[PDB]
Amino acid sequence: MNAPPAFESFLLFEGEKKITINKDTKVPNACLFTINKEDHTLGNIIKSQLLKDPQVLFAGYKVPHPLEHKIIIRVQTTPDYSPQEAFTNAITDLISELSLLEERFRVAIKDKQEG
């Protein structure tokens, strides 16, 4: 009755934007990425990569409520750089990072099978 559907955790609600970028006026060069229908599996993926970038001054994520299933990411960078670029560039590195891992795994998986 009151139990929420199990698929709402990942399913995208109709007429709801998956990603919303909101600028923060507390400190210059700061933005909030309120992703929806995601969990900590995605929040930690980008936060760690953002820290690796020297041009990132402050990057982090948090969940307002586990049942909400929406994650908020706050990114702040240098005046020359932009939080939007940091979020975009970091994702590309992850895709490249996983591509090497996926490709290298396929290289080594056959090696063990044959011996």
Partner 1 sequence: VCASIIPFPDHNQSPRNTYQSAMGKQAMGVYITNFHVRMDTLAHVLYYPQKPLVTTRSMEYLRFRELPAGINSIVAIASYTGYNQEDSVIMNRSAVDRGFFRSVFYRSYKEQESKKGFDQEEVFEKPTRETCQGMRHAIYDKLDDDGLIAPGVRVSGDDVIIGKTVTLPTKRDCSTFLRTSETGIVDQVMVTLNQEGYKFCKIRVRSVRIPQIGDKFASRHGQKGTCGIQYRQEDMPFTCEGITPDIIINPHAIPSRMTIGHLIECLQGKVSANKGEIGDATPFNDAVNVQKISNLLSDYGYHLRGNEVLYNGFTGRKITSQIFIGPTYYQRLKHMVDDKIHS
Partner 2 sequence: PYANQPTVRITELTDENVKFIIENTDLAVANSIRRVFIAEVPIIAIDWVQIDANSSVLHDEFIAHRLGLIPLTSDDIVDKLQYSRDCTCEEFCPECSVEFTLDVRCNEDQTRHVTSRDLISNSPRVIPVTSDDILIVKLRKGQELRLRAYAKKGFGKEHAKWNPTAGVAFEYDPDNALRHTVYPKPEEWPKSEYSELDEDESQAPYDPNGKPERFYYNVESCGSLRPETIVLSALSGLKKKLSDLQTQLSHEIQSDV
Partner 3 sequence: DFSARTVITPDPNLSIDQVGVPRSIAANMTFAEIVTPFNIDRLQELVRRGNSQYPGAKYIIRDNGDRIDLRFHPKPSDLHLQTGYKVERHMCDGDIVIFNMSMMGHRVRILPWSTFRLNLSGDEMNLHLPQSLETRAEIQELAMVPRMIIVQDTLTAVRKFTKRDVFLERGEVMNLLMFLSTWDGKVPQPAILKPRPLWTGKQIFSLIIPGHINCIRTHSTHPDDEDSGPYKHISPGDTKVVVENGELIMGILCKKSLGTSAGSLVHISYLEMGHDITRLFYSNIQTVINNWLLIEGHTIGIGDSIADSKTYQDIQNTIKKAKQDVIEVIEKAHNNELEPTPGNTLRQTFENQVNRILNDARDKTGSSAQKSLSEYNNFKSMVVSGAKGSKINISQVIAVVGQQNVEGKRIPFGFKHRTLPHFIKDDYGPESRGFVENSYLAGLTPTEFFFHAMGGREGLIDTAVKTAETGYIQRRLIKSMESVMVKYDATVRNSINQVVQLRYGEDGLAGESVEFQNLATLK
Among 78, 37, 88, which residue's Cα sits nearest to residue 58?
78
80 contact, one of partner 3, partner 1, partner 2, none, CB 5-8 Å limit per kind: none
Whether the CB-CB separation of 46 and 61 falls below 8 Å is answered with yes
Q: Is 93 in the site for partner 3 (CB under 8 A)?
A: no
Q: Is 7 in the site for partner 1 (CB under 8 A)?
A: no
Q: Which residue has the tokens 């990603």?
A: 19
Whether the CB-CB separation of 64 and 44 falls below 8 Å is answered with no
> According to CB under 8 A, which residues from 25 to 84 bind partner 3?
26-27, 30, 47-48, 51, 57-62, 64-67, 72, 74, 76
> According to CB under 8 A, which residues from 30 to 69 bind partner 2?
33, 35, 39-42, 44-45, 47-49, 52-55
Edge to edge, what strands does the sheet with 70-77 contain?
21-23, 30-36, 70-77, 56-62
> Where are the alpha helices (H) located in the chain, listed in sequence order?
40-52, 83-114
The one among 2, 4, 7, 28 contacting partner 2 by CB under 8 A: 7
Contacts with partner 3, residue ranges (CB under 8 A): 1-4, 24, 26-27, 30, 47-48, 51, 57-62, 64-67, 72, 74, 76
